[model samples]
Target chain A: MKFSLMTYSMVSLMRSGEMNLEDVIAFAANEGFDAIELLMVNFSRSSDEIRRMLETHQMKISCIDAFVDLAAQQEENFLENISLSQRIIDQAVELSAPMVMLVPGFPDLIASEKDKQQALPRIISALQKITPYAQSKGIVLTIENYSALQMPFCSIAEVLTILEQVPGLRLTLDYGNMLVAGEDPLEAYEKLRKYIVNAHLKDWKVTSGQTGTRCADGRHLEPSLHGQGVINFKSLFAEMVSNNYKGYLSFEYEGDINAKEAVRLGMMHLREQLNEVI
Target chain B: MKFSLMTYSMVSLMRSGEMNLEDVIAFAANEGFDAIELLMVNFSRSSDEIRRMLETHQMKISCIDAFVDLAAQQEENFLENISLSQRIIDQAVELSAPMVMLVPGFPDLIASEKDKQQALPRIISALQKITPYAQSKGIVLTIENYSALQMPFCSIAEVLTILEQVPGLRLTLDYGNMLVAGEDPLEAYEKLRKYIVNAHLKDWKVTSGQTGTRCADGRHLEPSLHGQGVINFKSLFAEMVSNNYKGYLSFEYEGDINAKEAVRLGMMHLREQLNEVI
Candidate 1:
């Protein structure tokens, strides 16, 4: 198993515009990350700059995070999301990354059972169009599960089913999301591991009876360090190691804490946990 | 109808960290706002300082923005979100604010479909617990929508259904979200007019349909001032006025353009549209 840190973990640092992309890459490399996952939204690094920076650090590109809403209103918008993913895939190819993340589509409204039934076809169609491109690039397109108000895609079972239907598509398992949704991360991973190309790690607690998983509503528990939250990391890591999964296990620390420190501590804990499991 | 400005429009200005609560309140006063919507996340002001500033500005608080996650694992965390909302409500009362903006629940992995199903009840119970306190203070709770992966509450219809089931809850209409969801703002207003307690306005467009809506993935499809996108302001505002809606219309410009100028332009456009309809 390879370890990587998500660039989003240092979103504040990146957004500060104080640290250049090269500095960020160097910071991650110095922190003991074998690889790094790049979030396009957080850093302003051009593809060339990213390539050069990674080369300088001798760090591998584990994954490229792309927010592709493939089920946009217009077909053009939907196609655009796919085309952009292709660009990210190209970047991944350049960086020797195995996977690129995509958000297949979000429902325009709170989907009723009926609405979901109707929207699934459109979602499948959009994914179908993008599958060939992903296969052609020799990169697996990992579809992330999305949760929001009227968010159509939330269930791992559903996502796994979708992946099974889409030949080259894979899953980007987010540990915190499954925990926030009240599903055991281990179970979700166990169920979807066959389709997973990449994984995201974040620790979340549900403060209210309701989890603050949706971006719009902002109702979630505090985000803490890896071992600090309710997530069962012991079993989670064990499952990964036991499975001999060679994919990137990217740490994503999105909380009020210091990004660098969080990453360091999280990685330390993960390494220790992996040591125990292995 | 009263007009207000969400201070997030001035995020860059406040970045200096020199502008205190008094300065923010004073700035809003100078802008001809009948009321001011205070974003709790952006303001450096303490609750007491904010209350005092609003009082001095002779401006009623339109709303207080709080990022709370009701869907947490621990009851304490959930209660903390409730308590935070209460604190904002208490502050709103001190400032003669009519409402406080809340993000509803987030969907979590640990949470079951049963958990998601139970969210409305949990939220309602929390609201009921807070309502008497809010009533004594003369404040209303307005739920806001966002599009994060875990956000469970995003639909106006879903919100309306919740409002219908739970008395004393209100809606904060965000114009940009309506367009993002492909919903007709005017039509949504027709369905949810009675529950609206406040409004947030912004504009969006699908710039490069090839990339998707993620800012980093796609090129900027112009994020212009009001009346520049698919949102039908003339019909929406007219409906609000016709319904005798008595609340604040806060201009929120989340674009790459200059915020102050965008707000000014948005204000002018809204006023012009209102005048034409009236």
Candidate 2:
């Protein structure tokens, strides 16, 4: 599998205005990543501008990750989210990105099951519309097991239920997110293996107290350096390779560790795992 | 010797707007530093505000490092630099800091022997006036072996030359900077030991090209984590303790490493050396 640097991994640094998109792209290229998964939430460059950067750095775009509030309660909000996705998909086509990953916005963390369930149909409807439009434009659309039960499509059951209803939609496996749903990543990968086209390699350390991101099973998970975290990436990499998973695994980091150092260490660990797996 | 966090080490982070003086003070306290060396270049807080922060964090002021353009070609500029030091010394009195370090600004890198020598009189003159003023205010005036030859008093001879002229002036021994002067730190330490009332623990990895800081001895040097560098800190620490040294060794770092992480690792290494020494 090819490795890609996710702009999402540097999202915190970008948000702080310490670095920009081109800066991160340059950093990723310097770090020897083969491709980039552009998380388009705060990205402001025109498609050609972005394509120019990738070409300048001798790199390619793996995917375009578009975040939208698909879980919005209002009909207009849901429509707006869909409109946003369509615009991003157009950019993806121009950039020659193979796929687009749609993220349903983070909803209320403590929302009731009934309240959260209502988001499923809205998310499904948004995907059904956005996926075909993306396909027509020659870009595949995918979603991820998003890392919290509060997130409507994080669990295997939720992901399976949504995939059953949507025809053109696929999956981007988030290695650490499955653990938040209290499912082993290997188990989640086995169950969702058929539809998985891309992956986000994120590492999270289980913690006590209210110090970290609250997981579905009442545990807290803090972002950690790869290999330093709880993930058995070597075994997981072997499992994915054995199953013929031939997609770009984008490095995703959100932690207190220096983002640049975190990415460097994360990629190093990923290469080590890839070596043993291949 | 007590360990003090040098604000100069975190100057890059502060200049980038990522952290502030108070933020660094809090970080030092949290990291278990006994005191802080308040580098007054970019410090904007009033003395009372600074004192309140120190009291709140239970940290004391180790010294006030005042950077001024003492090597100015013009008399007006030189006077302006001295005036600035006087103002900082007044602040030091209010903060209850025991000492203030005067730094001659960096001059022309490729300057001639005669051209560089001209800076000595200006630096000595600045210190001679500022020293008495600080003494009157009950604050000890000091200087350090700054890391470059272009710096007026970085070398052992230059530092001793100035100390002989200015009787009240003391030295802040910079462990790694001696290497920049092509002098062994141990040798520099032995010669300058009596004058050393405070110390700055910095580290430098020797480089071959023009990429790093150029030295008087013609070696290129880059900042590195404490123990990872060429400075023999364990031996240096042992020597300092053996010489009956009673001073605050402020941790100083300037490097490509993440400033926060650099400080953390630097302190860890410093503590390890201290343990071995004492």
Candidate 3:
């Protein structure tokens, strides 16, 4: 499996406005990552401009993060999110990016089973429209799995159901997000394995507190270093290896560790895992 | 001793261009620093604008760093460094900042004692010229004692001799720079005690490497957490406390530790040391 860096981890989200694109590239390049996940928010440059910048740095764009809400019921919001996806597709093509990471937006997962079921067709319709455009262009669109339970189509079951309805839709397997979703990583991978084009190896520590990053269950989700966290990285990677999962392992660490230190630790582990193989 | 943060450690110097001033202020405030030492290179806002920014953040400017070479030998280059000092002083006045830290720049320290001796008089004269402007404006120009021998006017004797020559100049005793220069922190503080108007608690770890950031004798110098380094923070702070050194103790950390982590660690140690007092 190819190892890559997610730009989202480099320029901290806590202090969002301070990060610049050039420095993000420089940081990843200096850290010796051959490929980077292009986070659209990290740049103001158009795809062509950014493409040249990447080309100049001799770094490959492993994935283009295309964030949007597909669950919008209103015509205007739905169309806008669709337009957003299309723009990201165009950007991916212009930047010579191979894949586009998508996040499926559906009606509230906890509102009721009926309401959740109703939102499915709308999402399927949206993806159906998106899939043709995506397939024709050869840009793999993978739905990113998040732990926020309200984030619909995050579960392996939903991702499976959605893939069946919408052609060319792949999966973005996030190891720790499944834990946040209260699903076993290996179990979910059992269902989503073949479709996962990209993997986000994020580690979120479980915590007990009145105040912290609140998840959908109103429980606190604290980000942590790889081995120190609740997520079983050893078993998870073992599952992927057993499954012959040959995809980019994006170091999508969303921890409190300093950006350099976090990325370095992630790289070190990936190297260690690689050594275990060779 | 007052606890303050040096901006040098607030953000990574390698990625200085990427860190925003407002975020640095927010990070410092969030980490509970009421006072900060700001470097001019990190800002574009005029003193008036920055003063307002500081006011908004409820943070006090403990020191406004005014770094300039006082050792330039050339008639042209010499005056330029002097002019740089004057501008820094001018900024301090506008910001109503009380102290301006100075770095003595002299001819190459390795080029023989006679040449180093020649630049000493010039450094004295340069500070002598700047001291009047600083004094009249109520700004204390402090010559920071660095650990690098190539950095003129850093050793206790060298700093003492220069302070004797320049009436208005005081010392900025950096705890770890003395170690970098192969001097004991407590011993150097003992000698340079009277002239020190401000202090920088920088911790540097000595490394035996074929390649790295080398000190004067070619041994590598690594920036480290306070207690992890060779510099004795416990003894150094004990000495400062006994002498009733109540001035701003700026965390002028030049260490490779995470910016926020380094500052937080410095703050934690200072609190622990403060508990040692009555």
Weakest ten-residue segment in model 1 chain A by summed lDDT = A106-115
Q: Which residue pairs collide, candidate 2?
A: none
Higher-ranked by TM-score: 2 or 3: 2
For the predicted complex of model 2, DockQ is 0.01
* Residues A4-123 of candidate 1: C-alpha lDDT, one tens digit per residue: 888767765654444555766788889888888876521223567777777888887777775545544334444555566566677778778877887654432212333345456667
State TM-scores per candidate: 0.52, 0.50, 0.48
Chain B alone, TM-score, model 1? 0.83
Q: Of the candidates shown, which would achieve the greatest lDDT relative to the real structure? A: 2
Better of 1 and 3 by DockQ: 1
Shift in Å, residue A120, candidate 1: 3.0
Structural similarity of chain A in candidate 2, as TM-score = 0.94
Each prediction's DockQ against the real complex: 0.02, 0.01, 0.01
TM-score of chain B of each: 0.83, 0.93, 0.89
Summarize candidate 2's per-residue lDDT along B1-278 as a digit string, tens digits: 78999887776576456777678899999999989998664333567788888888898998988656576554544565677678878888888999988776653221334335566787787888888898899888888887655556878988999999997889988878788778899899899888999988888876643332555666656678888888888888888888878889889887756789998998899899889877
Chain B TM-score, model 3, reads: 0.89
Name the lDDT value of residue B84 in candidate 3: 65
Q: In angstroms, how far off is B209's CA in candidate 3?
A: 1.0
